[PDB]
Amino acid sequence: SAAAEVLARNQELLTAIAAGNYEKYATMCDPSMTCFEPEAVGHLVEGLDFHKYYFTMPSAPPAPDAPKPHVLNTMASPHVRMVGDSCAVVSYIRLTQKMVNGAPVTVQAEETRVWEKKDGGWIHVHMHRSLVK
Amino acid sequence: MSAAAEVLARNQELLTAIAAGNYEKYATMCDPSMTCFEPEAVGHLVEGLDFHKYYFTMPSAPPAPDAPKPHVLNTMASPHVRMVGDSCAVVSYIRLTQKMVNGAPVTVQAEETRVWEKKDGGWIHVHMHRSLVK
Amino acid sequence: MSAAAEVLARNQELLTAIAAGNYEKYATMCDPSMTCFEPEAVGHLVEGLDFHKYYFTMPSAPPAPDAPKPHVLNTMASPHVRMVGDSCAVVSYIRLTQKMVNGAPVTVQAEETRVWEKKDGGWIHVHMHRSLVK
Amino acid sequence: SAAAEVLARNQELLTAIAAGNYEKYATMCDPSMTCFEPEAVGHLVEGLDFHKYYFTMPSAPPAPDAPKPHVLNTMASPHVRMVGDSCAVVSYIRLTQKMVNGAPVTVQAEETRVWEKKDGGWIHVHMHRSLVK
Amino acid sequence: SAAAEVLARNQELLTAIAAGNYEKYATMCDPSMTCFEPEAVGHLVEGLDFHKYYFTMPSAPPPKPHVLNTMASPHVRMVGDSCAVVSYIRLTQKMVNGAPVTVQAEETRVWEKKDGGWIHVHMHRSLVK
Amino acid sequence: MSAAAEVLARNQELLTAIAAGNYEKYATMCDPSMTCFEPEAVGHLVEGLDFHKYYFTMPSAPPAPDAPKPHVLNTMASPHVRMVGDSCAVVSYIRLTQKMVNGAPVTVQAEETRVWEKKDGGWIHVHMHRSLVK
Numbered sequence A, D: 001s002a003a004a005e006v007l008a009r010n011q012e013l014l015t016a017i018a019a020g021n022y023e024k025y026a027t028m029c030d031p032s033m034t035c036f037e038p039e040a041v042g043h044l045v046e047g048l049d050f051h052k053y054y055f056t057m058p059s060a061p062p063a064p065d066a067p068k069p070h071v072l073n074t075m076a077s078p079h080v081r082m083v084g085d086s087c088a089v090v091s092y093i094r095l096t097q098k099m100v101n102g103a104p105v106t107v108q109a110e111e112t113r114v115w116e117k118k119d120g121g122w123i124h125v126h127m128h129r130s131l132v133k
Numbered sequence B, C, F: 001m002s003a004a005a006e007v008l009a010r011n012q013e014l015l016t017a018i019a020a021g022n023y024e025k026y027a028t029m030c031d032p033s034m035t036c037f038e039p040e041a042v043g044h045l046v047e048g049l050d051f052h053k054y055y056f057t058m059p060s061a062p063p064a065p066d067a068p069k070p071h072v073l074n075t076m077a078s079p080h081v082r083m084v085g086d087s088c089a090v091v092s093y094i095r096l097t098q099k100m101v102n103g104a105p106v107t108v109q110a111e112e113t114r115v116w117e118k119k120d121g122g123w124i125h126v127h128m129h130r131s132l133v134k
Numbered sequence E: 001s002a003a004a005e006v007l008a009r010n011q012e013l014l015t016a017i018a019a020g021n022y023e024k025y026a027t028m029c030d031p032s033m034t035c036f037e038p039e040a041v042g043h044l045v046e047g048l049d050f051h052k053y054y055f056t057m058p059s060a061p062p063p064k065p066h067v068l069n070t071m072a073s074p075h076v077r078m079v080g081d082s083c084a085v086v087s088y089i090r091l092t093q094k095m096v097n098g099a100p101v102t103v104q105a106e107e108t109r110v111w112e113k114k115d116g117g118w119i120h121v122h123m124h125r126s127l128v129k
Helices: A004-017 A024-028 A050-055 B003-020 B023-029 B050-056 C003-020 C023-029 C052-058 D002-019 D023-027 D049-055 E002-021 E022-028 E049-055 F003-021 F023-029 F048-057
Strands: A029-036 A070-084 A089-098 A103-118 A121-131 B031-036 B073-084 B087-100 B104-119 B123-134 C030-037 C071-083 C088-101 C104-121 C122-130 D031-034 D073-084 D086-102 D103-118 D122-129 E029-036 E070-077 E085-094 E099-113 E116-129 F032-037 F074-083 F088-101 F103-117 F122-132
Touching: A004 A029, A004 A070, A004 A089, A004 A103, A004 B003, A004 B087, A024 A029, A024 F048, A029 B087, A029 D122, A050 A103, A050 C071, A050 C088, A070 D086, A089 B123, A089 E099, A103 B123, A103 D023, A121 B073, A121 B087, A121 B104, A121 D122, B003 B087, B003 B104, B003 B123, B003 C088, B003 C104, B003 F103, B023 B031, B031 B050, B031 D122, B050 B073, B050 C030, B050 E099, B073 C071, B073 D049, B087 D049, C003 C023, C003 C052, C003 C071, C003 C104, C003 C122, C003 F122, C023 C030, C023 C052, C030 D086, C052 E070, C052 E116, C071 F023, C088 D122, C122 D002, C122 D103, C122 D122, C122 F088, D002 D023, D002 D086, D002 D103, D023 D031, D023 D073, D073 E070, D073 F074, E002 E022, E002 E070, E002 E085, E022 E049, E029 E049, E029 F088, E085 F122, E099 F122, E116 F003, E116 F088, E116 F103, F003 F023, F003 F074, F003 F088, F003 F103, F003 F122, F023 F048, F048 F074
Parallel strands: A029 A121, B031 B123, C030 C122, D031 D122, E029 E116, F032 F122
Antiparallel strands: A070 A089, A089 A103, A103 A121, B073 B087, B087 B104, B104 B123, C071 C088, C088 C104, C104 C122, D073 D086, D086 D103, D103 D122, E070 E085, E085 E099, E099 E116, F074 F088, F088 F103, F103 F122
C-alpha cells in the first residue's frame, strides 16, 4: 500500500514533467537531488537549476492553428523496493509517447528514482536515467 | 569514522570482487532479490543473482604463456553517498575500469547508482543501475 | 562558513559573469597576469586579459530580430576545492554548459582547473586550464 | 631560485614517469593528488592507484631488437607562478619524444602541475593534461 | 628591463601590422631587413617593399576589423650589447564569416639597438597548422 | 678575411657535423641554452641540447649489406650573414640536403635561420629557426 502511494507520487512527477509544470516538479524534489541523465552527458549533477533550464527554454508564442501538446508517460513493469520505512526505490522503463513531425514516436529509458519520506510526504532525492537503443 | 565512508568502502569491495571474478564474495554481498539495470540486460530490469553468476562462470580457455595475470582496476570517480532514512544508503559515482585489451590499456566509463541496505550488522547490495557513456 | 566554500562561490560568480557577457565583472575577478590553457589558444599558454577580452567584444548582427534572450547555464559537476596554503585555492570540476543551438538545447562539457589567489582581501582568478571532453 | 627548485622537481617527476620508476613518482606526489588527463576519459580522479596501474602493466617478453626504450620528456616554455608562500603552479607544453615503428615521433600535451611546499621540499598535488590536436 | 623594452617594441610592431599602419611599421624596421615567411614561398626576401605590398592592397569601402595579436610564451635573448632575439608563438585572433579563428605561427624576430631605440632587422615566420 | 665569412664557415661546419651524425662536435659548437624552432618540436620553442641529442642517439646497431655508406650533402643556398654588433651574427639561408631514399637521390629544402654568439674568441650557435618548404 505504501508502494502504491510511492508509485502514485512517481506518476504524478512524470505527468508534471510532461506538462512543463516546473512548480509542481520542484515541489516534489529535494533541493539536493542527484541526477544521472543523458542531458548531463555522463556526469552526476546536483540541484534543480539544471532541470529548471529545460523547463524555461525560450520558445514563447506559437501559431495557434489546431495543434496542442500531446505527450504521455508510461511506467512499464514498475518495481518498488522499500528500504526501511522512510525510503523507496522505484525502478521501471519510462515509455514517452510524443509527436515529432506530425507522427507518433515512443521513447524508452531505464529509470531508477529514489524517494524519501520527509515531513509527511514522499520527496524525490535521486534519479538515474539511461536511454535504451 | 563515518557510515558513509563504510558504505563507500563496501562498494569498492564489491567492485574488487567483481574485478577478481570472485562470485562467492559477490553473492555474499548481494541480496538474492537484487534488482539490476545494466547494458547486458539489454534495456530490462532483471532480478536475482543467476543473471550475474552467468558472467562469473563463463567457459574460459585455460591459461597459457601469454600474460598470466589479469590487470584490472576499478575507480569510483567523484563518489556521492546519500543516507535515505535509517536503513538505506545510495552510492552514485562514475565507474572507471582500467583493463587490458590486445596488450594495450583501455579505460571504460559507466554511470553507476548502487543502493545498499543495513541488514544484520552489515551493508547488502539490493539495487544497481549501470549506464555506458559514449 | 569556509574558505573553500567562498572560493567555490567566487568560481560560480565568474562562470555566471562569463555566461552573461559581463566583461567588466570578469576582469574585476581576474588578475591582469592571468595564465590560460584553453582550446581557443590552440595548444599554447596565453597570458593577460586581452586574449579573453577579444571574445567579449566580438561584433554582432543587430540584436532582437524576433530572437529570445540568451538562455545559458554553467554547472560545476563534482567540484573539488584544494587549499594550498593560506592564499591559494585550486577549483577543479567538469563545466557543463547548457546553451541553445538553433531551437534545441545542447550540453557542452569541459575539464576545468581554476587557480585563485587571496590578495588584497579578495580572491582573484590567476590561472585556468580548460580541456574539451566532447 | 625557488621557481628553479620547483622546475627541477617537475623535470625529475617527468623523468621518473619516463623511466617507469613508480617508487620515485609516488614519493614525489601527495597521496590525495587530483588529476585531469585523457586516460581519465573526462573525469577527475584522486589518488595514486589510477596512475600506478600504468607502471604495473603485464610486461611483454624482451626480444633483443630494442633493448632500451628511447623516450625523452621536454618542458617547452615553462611558466612558474608563486601563489602564496607554499604553492607553485608550473604550466608548460610537455613534448614526449618516443620511438614508434623504428621512426621517432613527438607527442605534445598541455600540462598544468601544482606543487605544495611542505617543510623544505615540494610535492605534487594536482595535474591537468590535455592532448594537443 | 631591456628585454621588457624589446618585447614592448615587438608588441607595438605587431599591433601596427594588425592595424594596417604601414608608416609606423616601416619606421620600426631597418630598410635592409631580411625575412622568411609563407608569402615569400620558400625564399629569403630583403627590404620593405615586399611587405609594403600587403598594406596597400586595393579594398572596398562597405562590420569592424576585430584582430588581436598575442605573443605566446616569449623568449628574449641578448646576444652582445647590440642584439636581441625575440622568439614566440604569434597567435592572431581574427574573424572569418561570423566566427572567431585563432591562427598560430612560429615567429623569430631580431632587433638591433641603435643609439636610442630598437629596430627590427630580421624575421622568420613558420606556419604550424 | 671577414668575420661574416668566418661565421659562414662555422655554419657549414655545423651542417657537416649534423650530416655525419657527429653529436660531440655538434654539442661543442652549440651553447647549452640554445633555443630552437623546428618541425620536430611540433610548433613550440625548445631549449637545450637533449632534444637534439635524442636524434643522434636513436636505436640502431647493424649496417645491412643492402645499403652502403650514407651519401648526404648540405648546401647553403644564397646565404646571408648579418652582423648585429660585435658579438652576434645571423646566418639565413635555404638548406638543401641531398640524401638517398631507397635507391634514388632526393633534395630536401628548408628555410634556416641560425644565430651565433662570439664567446671567448669562438663562435657558438645559440638559436635556430627551421621551416620546411616541401
